[PDB]
Amino acid sequence: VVMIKLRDELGTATTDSAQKILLLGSGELGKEIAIEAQRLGVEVVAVDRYANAPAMQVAHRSYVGNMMDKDFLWSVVEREKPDAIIPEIEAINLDALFEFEKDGYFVVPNARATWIAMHRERLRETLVKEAKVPTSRYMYATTLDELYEACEKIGYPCHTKAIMSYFVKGPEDIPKAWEKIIVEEHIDFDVEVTELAVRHFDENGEIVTTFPKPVGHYQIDGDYHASWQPAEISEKAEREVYRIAKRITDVLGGLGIFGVEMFVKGDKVWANEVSPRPHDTGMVTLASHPPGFSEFALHLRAVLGLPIPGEWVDGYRLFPMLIPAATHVIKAKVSGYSPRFRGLVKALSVPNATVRLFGKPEAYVGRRLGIALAWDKDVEVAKRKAEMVAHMIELRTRSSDWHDQ
Amino acid sequence: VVMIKLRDELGTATTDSAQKILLLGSGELGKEIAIEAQRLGVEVVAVDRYANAPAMQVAHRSYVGNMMDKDFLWSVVEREKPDAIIPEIEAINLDALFEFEKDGYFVVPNARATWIAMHRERLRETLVKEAKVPTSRYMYATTLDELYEACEKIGYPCHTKAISYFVKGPEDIPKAWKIIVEEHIDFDVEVTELAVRHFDENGEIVTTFPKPVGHYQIDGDYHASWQPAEISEKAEREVYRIAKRITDVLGGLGIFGVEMFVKGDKVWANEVSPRPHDTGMVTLASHPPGFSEFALHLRAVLGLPIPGEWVDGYRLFPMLIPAATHVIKAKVSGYSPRFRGLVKALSVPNATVRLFGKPEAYVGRRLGIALAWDKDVEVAKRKAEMVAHMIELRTRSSDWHDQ
Known part of the structure; x- marks a missing residue:
């Protein structure tokens, strides 16, 4: 407790x-x-x-x-x-x-x-x-034999991953995808969303859960690439996102912000997974939430035992969004010490955007080195702008040449 | 240069x-x-x-x-x-x-x-x-004689101090006695214009203007500030005009805190600080992330660009949402300050506080600020003040004191 x-x-x-x-x-x-x-x-x-x-x-x-x-x-x-x-x-x-x-x-x-x-x-x-929440159809596999049975039963296309991954569309990918694997049914969803539910104290000293607007995002090879708030989903699905998240966090308990991962198709919502701490897609709140209220400040406040202002609406305590925004990662395509970035004259002249460079002393292929942040009344404009700012930037290391993206 | x-x-x-x-x-x-x-x-x-x-x-x-x-x-x-x-x-x-x-x-x-x-x-x-900008009318005086001639031309009432006293009539002249005689201005509001000189995409220096910041000083120490200041579009444009002139003369790169007095459509330049100004902390909430007066100064002095929006010959910097701040002043001295009243203070919607981390306090020391935002600036001003006053201060060797 x-x-x-x-x-x-x-x-x-x-x-x-x-x-x-x-x-x-x-x-x-x-x-x-x-x-x-x-x-x-x-x-x-x-x-x-x-x-x-x-x-x-x-x-x-x-x-x-x-x-x-x-x-x-x-x-x-x-x-x-x-x-x-x-x-x-x-x-x-x-x-x-x-x-x-x-x-x-x-x-x-x-x-x-x-x-x-x-x-x-x-x-x-x-x-x-x-938590008793809906998830995609699935089954586990201990051996290649159990794997064939699983992929064949779930039907094709098919998602495979280790418990700690591959995408099989036919019986010929089964071997190429192979321990303990999780075989999942492919859902042609409209968008992936992260619900940043936060468990914190109210003035009575009891724990309440307040919900920020769902965060949309897409991952490039299992790696978050861009995110935005709010996700363009229907109100019905939105309420279903809060409902599922509540069930998840109610079971997990404690204090802190959670990154509840879900899939949305029309008004339908499936729960995928959850991390009990701030999540990378949530960096968009560095711009979409007002100052002192990003998922990081919300997390901090929650775990120090401090309150968080909310807004009740139809049974759910919501956290009001300030302005739609989006982010896009700045990934390294090289290795080496002392990274440096160029293209800032054009990247930083773009209105309603900016970048954040993390300060990592060293780079490796794929390491996230910063993000572009953008905001606009139209979430779709913000998204496009964040991608454009990130793409105007080139990275270099002490022992490498300039590379883009 | x-x-x-x-x-x-x-x-x-x-x-x-x-x-x-x-x-x-x-x-x-x-x-x-x-x-x-x-x-x-x-x-x-x-x-x-x-x-x-x-x-x-x-x-x-x-x-x-x-x-x-x-x-x-x-x-x-x-x-x-x-x-x-x-x-x-x-x-x-x-x-x-x-x-x-x-x-x-x-x-x-x-x-x-x-x-x-x-x-x-x-x-x-x-x-x-x-700079050739309007300011308060003034003149100097070396002799009691000249002091009288100065107060007479400047008009009454008038301020006087040496390199002070407030003369409301030609009966305090002697009582008031290098001296300076400054006229009086019953302004409506004091404003700070955070003009920023930085490079544009072409490698040339431009000056961009954020919305005027209003504030009121309590015994020389600023107490509350807000953006935008409640002034007419004509006074606003005059502010930008006066600021441009002051900063063109100072030059360099960075943000300036140009202080002015506004009365209706009339504007007077009063003072200027060639660096971020405390009234500008309001931009920590009124400006977009990465664009408060502090990030503007930083970007400018590193030679990086700053997005702007041209409007009638003036390169302006768009505000995100009206906001206000209110100081959290210490009324005691001592080491290891602490603050209470947070349960109620931080439960107030559309607001928060920044606590500076100063390891020690002295009477009058600014230890933090309350920040508030709202579509209505008056609501923001009201809220910041309310949040600030819900907080009480203590030191290792003192009792709890309110704002």
């Missing part, structure tokens, strides 16, 4: 009255969290596997070590005694989180949630049995 | 390709400059007279020393070799700034501007003789 209570007070970072958050993972998402915390005078300690990670250039202090190493994490936690331990990624020692929580440290949203979302089978079963 | 040029590229903080700014003064204003710089992967070095000042907490590195000491500043500059030296306050060694500039370092907007704005009468002369 939530380790903390409604908070009415805050002290000052670097002094003895300070509240402190511990970020386990210091990528671009942890960075925005550290920024909101700094804007609130909250002490920030960032942790990750390499030095000068984005969040730690902004943090008061940082620690560098293997985050799958329980001893490392414990040394840090015992040294810092933070008000909140905030996982930014999945690759963190799960036992350590349970131990911190069991010892009285607030693990966001709770240890169990990170554990559940780690195992795809556990998650899907939790979604079906406990 | 401006020493850098249009910028098309940026490296990465903490690596050898990094661009780097040096903040001379690390209070709340430098803090937001530091935040936008971090969001652009720009390396930040924060400097001030005390440790863990707001901007240092956010910066990559910091230096602490007496900023009136030229040797100290030179040591930092020589060590860091920043792309931009951004003065946050006025109390900085001026010779030092001139020396940096002469040695090839880019002092924002330029050293001369900081020197002029610091010298009250030299600024007043610039405004009149060079």
Whole structure:
């Protein structure tokens, strides 16, 4: 049960009255969290596997070590005694989180949630049995034999992925797609959406769930590429998105923002998966939500025990959107140290847009190095503008040549 | 003249390709400059007279020393070799700034501007003789005789101080006695115009104008500000006109806080600060993300472009939503400040607060702000004030005090 209570007070970072958050993972998402915390005078300690990670250039202090190493994490936690331990990624020692929580440290949203979302089978079963929400047809496969049976039964085209992926359209892709796989039925959906439901305290000290507008997005090879708010869906589906998300978060519990992933086709909605922490597609809220209220600020506030203003409408407590916006990733196509970006004269002259460069010290093929942010009364204009700003930018490394996209 | 040029590229903080700014003064204003710089992967070095000042907490590195000491500043500059030296306050060694500039370092907007704005009468002369913009009528006096002749021509009532007293009639002349005699202006509202000089897509310097910012000063200290100010379209255009003239003379790159008085359609230039101004914190909510006065200054001084919208010969900067701010002032002294009343304060819709992180308080110290937005500026003003006053302050060695 939530380790903390409604908070009415805050002290000052670097002094003895300070509240402190511990970020386990210091990528671009942890960075925005550290920024909101700094804007609130909250002490920030960032942790990750390499030095000068984005969040730690902004943090008061940082620690560098293997985050799958329980001893490392414990040394840090015992040294810092933070008000909140905030996982930014999945690759963190799960036992350590349970131990911190069991010892009285607030693990966001709770240890169990990170554990559940780690195992795809556990998650899907939790979604079906406990949350009782609709999902695409599916079945598991332990061996190539069970795989043939699964793909043949689900019917073609067919989605395949490991529990921790391939797209089979015919019996000939079955072998090429092959352990434990999840075979899913293909749904010709209108759009993929992330519902950024946040569990936080109301003035009575009870936990409520408020919902931001659904976030639309598309992924290039299982990697978020662009997102926008609000997703162009019908009101009926929108209410169904909030309903499914509520069931999911009600089961997960704790405090924090969730990235509930769903598929929308007309008025129909299927639940796919969920991450118990801020999600990359949610970066659009850096522009679509008003200041101090992006998914990062919402997450921070929620886990410190602070309130979040809402707006009740037909049984659901909603979080009002300020202006439609969209983002587009700036991915590296090269490796090397000291990245640099060009094409800013044209990229930064585009109205109602801007970019954010994460500060990652090094690049590898595919590493997200920043995003283009755009806003407009017409979400479709914003989307196109974000893509255009991102595409006007070229990246280079110390030991490589300029490349685009 | 401006020493850098249009910028098309940026490296990465903490690596050898990094661009780097040096903040001379690390209070709340430098803090937001530091935040936008971090969001652009720009390396930040924060400097001030005390440790863990707001901007240092956010910066990559910091230096602490007496900023009136030229040797100290030179040591930092020589060590860091920043792309931009951004003065946050006025109390900085001026010779030092001139020396940096002469040695090839880019002092924002330029050293001369900081020197002029610091010298009250030299600024007043610039405004009149060079900027050629309207200001309050004034004149000087060396002898009681001339004081009488001055007050007489200036009209009553009038203000008088030396290089003060308020004479309402020719009976206080002696009581009032180099002196300056400044007329009085019963203005409707005080406004700050945040003109920004930066490069355009063609590599040429333009000046773009955000909507005028309204505010009211309480004993020299600003208390509340808002955007847009409630003035006529004719006064608004005059504001842009006056600002353009003032900034054309100051030159350089960066944002300016041009202070003016508005009465109906009449506008008077009063003062100018060649750097982000505290009344401008309202842009943290009224302007779009990455475009508050702090990001505008940053982009400008790095030589990066800034989107604008031409309207009647003026390159304007569009506002996102009306907003307002209200200060959170300390009424006590001491270390390790803390704030309560957050359950109610942060439950108010369309508002939030920024707490600066200052490790210590003194009576009158600005410790944070309440921010509020709304389609109706009056509602925003009202809300910020309300949120600010719901907050109470305490120090390690003091009792709780309200606003």
